[PDB]
Write a protein that binds this ligand. Structure first.
Ligand SMILES: COCCCc1ccc(Cl)c(CN(C(=O)[C@H]2CNCC[C@@H]2c2ccc(OCCOc3c(Cl)cc(C)cc3Cl)cc2)C2CC2)c1
Ligand SMILES: *[C@@H]1O[C@H](CO)[C@@H](O)[C@H](O)[C@H]1NC(C)=O
Lengths: 162, 171
């Protein structure tokens, strides 16, 4: 490859750094943390009841608004200290910087209010390895790697002060 | 002011200075490297033999194990609150450096890099950017270097050579 993708971040109070990504056709846009400590893409679902606080005040992905979406439905779980996170697999087209990628990801249908209600961001994109990935779903950077469009199979972080 | 930046497929020289010092992963499967010591002042108080350093862009803080943290805070002189550690705001700037031994270099965070200096008064408490976190196997037990650390050192994650790269950040 020859291209370099880059994504601007918002620094909320030296504790939360997040940037914009788009899912589907046309793109529905989300604020996410890029996590090297984790390996899955997770966003909130339109199936998340408004009775979940951690959802009501965040953005929700609606598959019913996307012409590119491809159903899977396999159920998947993650265990936090404060409770459990679950939802189901979906596939759609995700855009990060100038990069368009077909990707499997999670739609959350239930998550505890804490700490999730305190995020200014809507979800997470994991920058970790497949070994860690839940359901052994393929991580985003592996699919980016496979396209053959990056100058080098690296990525870097800059975080400002406040 | 730019809050931050993530580059895919390279780095950005405008946001660091120097060249990278690179370290190999204990094992592929996790962005985790070896750490040879944690120092308070110019003495090597903690993780003396060797410990594990998880390099976590998705965390707010530096995190150590309970054991490690009690010992770091004790050395600093901090009071433990329910969810955090605090010092009297007036002695926040009098705080010693904390140094990390990674590869062939000491990585030095100062008082200004790890204390939330909201006041300077003797009658106020100031929060530190360092918390306890017990992580379970096979990834845990480990240290974890989150935003606190990444603010001072610009970080390259290199998948071709399974190595992580450091450089002093520019602001
Ligand atoms: C610079 O970013 C630091 C932000 C610190 C922060 C603040 C709030 C939250 Cl809830 C989190 C939660 N996170 C973490 O604690 C990670 C830290 N590394 C190891 C894995 C941890 C993790 C924890 C939870 C997790 O989530 C499952 C589902 O993911 C969601 C999250 Cl985390 C938040 C919202 C609003 C919605 C969804 Cl769908 C995924 C990963 C996610 C990375 C964000 C982190
Ligand atoms: C969804 O994807 C997984 C691979 O992660 C596959 O094993 C599974 O059968 C798929 N489910 C359906 C219903 O197609």
């Amino acid at each position: 490859g020859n291209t370099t993708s880059s994504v601007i971040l918002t620094n909320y109070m030296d504790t939360q750094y997040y940037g914009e990504i788009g899912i589907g056709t046309p793109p529905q846009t989300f604020k996410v943390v890029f996590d090297t400590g984790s390996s899955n893409v997770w966003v909130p679902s339109s199936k998340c009841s408004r009775l979940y606080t951690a959802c009501v005040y965040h953005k929700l992905f609606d598959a019913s608004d996307s012409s590119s979406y491809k159903h899977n439905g396999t159920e998947l779980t993650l265990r936090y200290s404060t409770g459990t996170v679950s939802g189901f697999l979906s596939q759609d087209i995700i855009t990060v910087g100038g990069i368009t990628v077909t990707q499997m990801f999670g739609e959350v249908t239930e998550m505890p209010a804490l700490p999730f209600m305190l995020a200014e961001f809507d979800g997470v994109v994991g920058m970790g390895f497949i070994e860690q990935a839940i359901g052994r779903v393929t991580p985003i950077f592996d699919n980016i790697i496979s396209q053959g469009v990056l100058k080098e199979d690296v990525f870097s972080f800059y975080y400002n002060r406040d | 002011s730019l809050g931050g930046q993530i580059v895919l497929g390279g780095s950005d020289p405008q946001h660091y200075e120097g060249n990278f010092h690179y370290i190999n992963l204990i094992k592929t499967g996790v962005w985790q490297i070896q750490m040879k010591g944690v120092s308070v002042g110019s003495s090597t108080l903690l993780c003396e033999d060797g410990c594990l350093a998880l390099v976590d862009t998705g965390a707010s803080y530096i995190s150590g194990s309970t054991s490690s943290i009690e010992k770091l805070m004790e050395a600093l002189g901090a009071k433990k609150r329910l969810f955090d550690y605090v010092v009297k705001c007036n002695e926040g700037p009098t705080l010693p450096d904390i140094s990390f031994h990674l590869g062939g270099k000491e990585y030095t965070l100062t008082s200004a890099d790890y204390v939330f200096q909201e006041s300077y008064s003797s009658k106020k408490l100031c929060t530190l950017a360092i918390h306890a976190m017990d992580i379970p196997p096979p990834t845990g037990p480990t240290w974890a270097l989150g935003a606190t650390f990444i603010r001072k050192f610009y970080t390259e994650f290199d998948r071709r050579n399974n190595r992580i790269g450091f450089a002093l950040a520019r602001h």
